Design a protein around this ligand. Structure first.
Ligand SMILES: *CC(=O)N1C[C@@H](c2ccccc2)C[C@@H]1C(=O)Nc1cccc2ccccc12
Ligand SMILES: [Ca+2]
Ligand SMILES: [Ca+2]
Ligand SMILES: [Ca+2]
Ligand SMILES: [Ca+2]
Lengths: 107, 97
């Protein structure tokens, strides 16, 4: 980084959130095989680099195939965009329930 | 008096946080504080998702949207039904990709 970097505020961050959801999928889904689906190696790379806060530092290797079968609803061994949206929606519902129930919880 | 900023090493995680916090920025204004009524839903759409609104901004347009999103027919949009809405938008955006 030897030149200035310029940044602009976002008027509608929820719209940019949607753009990031779409682009992150294709960042990995186009690495091998079908360019519009995620295979196990691409999904594992996505979660590890893009969603580490949700992985609980678990790297056993057996764990991923359980999630992959969960996400693979049409059972074609890959995750398409619609199944990826079900996944993200599910993560977001979990975060929302943590927020909504927080004042009632204790460690 | 200090202001603080951070870079976002994992922007997909922040996008998820924006999805959650945007919901609650509008759902607590009226009535049930964890669901969007028609008024709250209209405000969220116009302010947070203006690129997906369209010229159709009549009250019949928002009432049809409310009806398409309110799956359990309680005249509110809860967080799950809001997620279905957002996934539909994502899937549209992806088609044009
Ligand atoms: C939305 C949801 O239920 N889940 C998201 C998933 C996740 C794991 C790591 C990083 C980001 C998201 C965990 C969870 C899930 O889908 N669990 C699923 C259902 C039951 C059992 C089970 C067992 C082992 C692996 C996954 C699994
Ligand atoms: Ca692929
Ligand atoms: Ca699949
Ligand atoms: Ca409300
Ligand atoms: Ca409802």
């Amino acid at each position: 980084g030897t030149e200035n970097l310029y940044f602009q505020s976002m008027a509608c961050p929820l719209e940019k959130a949607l753009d990031v959801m779409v682009s992150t999928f294709h960042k990995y889904s186009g690495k091998e095989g079908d360019k519009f689906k995620l295979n196990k190696s691409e999904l594992k790379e996505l979660l590890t680099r893009e969603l580490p806060s949700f992985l609980g530092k678990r790297t056993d290797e057996a764990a991923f195939q359980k999630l992959m079968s969960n996400l693979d609803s049409n059972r074609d061994n890959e995750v398409d965009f619609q199944e990826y949206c079900v996944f993200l929606s599910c993560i977001a519902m979990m975060c929302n329930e943590f927020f909504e129930g927080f004042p009632d919880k204790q460690p």
